[PDB]
Design a protein around this ligand. Sequence first.
Ligand SMILES: NC(=O)c1ccc[n+]([C@@H]2O[C@H](COP(=O)([O-])OP(=O)(O)OC[C@H]3O[C@@H](n4cnc5c(N)ncnc54)[C@H](OP(=O)(O)O)[C@@H]3O)[C@@H](O)[C@H]2O)c1
Ligand SMILES: NC(=O)c1ccc[n+]([C@@H]2O[C@H](COP(=O)([O-])OP(=O)(O)OC[C@H]3O[C@@H](n4cnc5c(N)ncnc54)[C@H](OP(=O)(O)O)[C@@H]3O)[C@@H](O)[C@H]2O)c1
Ligand SMILES: CC1(C)CCC(C)(C)c2cc(NC(=O)c3ccc(C(=O)O)cc3)ccc21
Lengths: 207, 206
Amino acid sequence: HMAVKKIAIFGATGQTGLTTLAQAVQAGYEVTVLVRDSSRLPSEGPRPAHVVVGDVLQAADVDKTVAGQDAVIVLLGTRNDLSPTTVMSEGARNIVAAMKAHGVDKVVACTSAFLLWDPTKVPPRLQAVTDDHIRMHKVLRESGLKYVAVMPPHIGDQPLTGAYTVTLDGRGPSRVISKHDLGHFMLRCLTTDEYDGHSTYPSHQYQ
Amino acid sequence: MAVKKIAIFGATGQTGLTTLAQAVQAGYEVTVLVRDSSRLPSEGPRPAHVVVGDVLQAADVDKTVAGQDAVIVLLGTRNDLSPTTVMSEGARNIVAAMKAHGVDKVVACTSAFLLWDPTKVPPRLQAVTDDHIRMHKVLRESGLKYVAVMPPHIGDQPLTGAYTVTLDGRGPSRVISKHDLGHFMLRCLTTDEYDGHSTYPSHQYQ
Ligand SMILES: NC(=O)c1ccc[n+]([C@@H]2O[C@H](COP(=O)([O-])OP(=O)(O)OC[C@H]3O[C@@H](n4cnc5c(N)ncnc54)[C@H](OP(=O)(O)O)[C@@H]3O)[C@@H](O)[C@H]2O)c1
Ligand SMILES: NC(=O)c1ccc[n+]([C@@H]2O[C@H](COP(=O)([O-])OP(=O)(O)OC[C@H]3O[C@@H](n4cnc5c(N)ncnc54)[C@H](OP(=O)(O)O)[C@@H]3O)[C@@H](O)[C@H]2O)c1
Ligand SMILES: CC1(C)CCC(C)(C)c2cc(NC(=O)c3ccc(C(=O)O)cc3)ccc21
């Protein structure tokens, strides 16, 4: 019945991206992914409708990915690399410009629950990556787009439940969210305007 | 000192716009150098003088620095991904103009990266950070009374006037509102105590 039907997913080959992609395909979305390496997509796994091979640091590649979409999901990250980086904030800059040029309004983007923390209490080893989450959140907040700021705590390997808590504009009662539940939530944000302009912290107790 | 007339370079950026607004509200006679005056707000506080030009033309810079009591430098080129000298070349023009016109006080903003180990700088920001360093040395070698403002993350929180200022080192917090940052650049015009120092404004925003 397709109010939102065509979506771009950035970071679809990552931990959360892969299950977000699987869930999106099963839910009937027509998914376009931007991937650096097509081999990162599972050969047996569910196939997106459209693959763009390129880099989020090329405006041209982002433009090709955002063209014609109804909404954008952002799950960019640096895997376990804790080095100083601007890939997420610069990627978000390109995504914002592409959305504005192509008339896409809705962006659901994952940073981190550390953006709800006292900034001085972030573990030093995570500060470089958190610094770029901060830069990225500022890019998206200042864009004027309909931006849902997803700020998860630890991403785990527990099941899909669809039963997690969503805390608005503050830290939630648990310190973990499964990658499957986080992906479920990213997609849920496509079906409602209630989180637009808010920060959201999904979390759950797996039992 | 008795600072009434200031030039602002970089007035159309995010920090420059609120520094300009606050300077006009406080009563400074502000001159700005802009490439396109349509980039200045049509409403609210407006500067007293507008020079149309850019910081890479020594004549435009001389026209902007002439007659001033102090200079505020809010130049940026963080669009740049690879070696660039716009900021340091601009500071060279500004220093030459201040010397020619007898202007002694410069308050310039670079980045708190200049107070961190260089391995803290993200690779795609190293070029702009390298030119921040070059601009800082151009101003440190100046012999002019130079306050180096080296802020951390610049946020959009409302003005508080309650931030802390750390001297020659990093402070406790890691963010400064663009409004508090502009407030501090203006405060540097009212005192000698920061001259020849690096300054790190920061605050925790409830
Ligand atoms: N407990 C946690 O792990 C945790 C907690 C809170 C927040 N976070 C944050 O949550 C977000 C998602 O985490 P995650 O574990 O699901 O992600 P991830 O496994 O790190 O995957 C990151 C995705 O971004 C892609 N990517 C990186 N650079 C790219 C580039 N230049 N161009 C195009 N794509 C690029 C990656 O592609 P490749 O496959 O080519 O590498 C990958 O698909 C991250 O930002 C993370 O920092 C994680
Ligand atoms: N973003 C951060 O979190 C952060 C943190 C620490 C430090 N800083 C640094 O603080 C400084 C200012 O902050 P910002 O973010 O507000 O900068 P910004 O938004 O990028 O503003 C750039 C300003 O620089 C002027 N400019 C650039 N090249 C010029 C040229 N040839 N001639 C004349 N003017 C020129 C521009 O004037 P015209 O447009 O009229 O040409 C413009 O007003 C920057 O250097 C930045 O790197 C930023
Ligand atoms: C850089 C990266 C991807 C490396 C891997 C780990 C180390 C896994 C990681 C962990 C977090 N954050 C959290 O795990 C977390 C947990 C609870 C709260 C909270 O209680 O608010 C907040 C944040 C953020 C980024 C990262």
